[PDB]
């Protein structure tokens, strides 16, 4: 009945992308199963960083063909790799 205690909660990582970089395979990001989503990893990171999050190539099965281009509205699965980009254009102060 009332839930609240450890079960089924399963632990999906993925392996970030950093541009110009490799991906560490070594120090992925862990995210509970009952959360995974882009949107989710960017405040990993950064509690910031969706705010300049433009887009995410997930390489596996996720996506039939990739690399593809995906938002933060995206679901992630475990053992996927993500390129988080920044856009590019002039920023004032």
């Known amino acids: 009945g009332s839930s609240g205690s450890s079960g089924y909660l399963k632990l999906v990582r993925i392996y970030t992308k950093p ?5 560490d395979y070594t ?3 862990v995210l509970p199963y009952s959360r995974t989503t882009v949107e989710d990893f ?3 990171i950064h509690k910031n960083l969706i705010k300049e999050f433009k887009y995410a190539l997930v390489w596996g099965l996720s996506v039939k063909h990739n690399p593809q281009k995906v938002g933060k509205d995206h679901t992630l699965e475990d053992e996927d790799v993500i390129q988080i980009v920044k856009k590019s254009g002039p920023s004032s102060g």
């Open 27 to 29: 120090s992925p990001v």
């Open 19 to 23: 541009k110009g970089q490799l991906p």
């Open 42 to 44: 960017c405040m990993k």
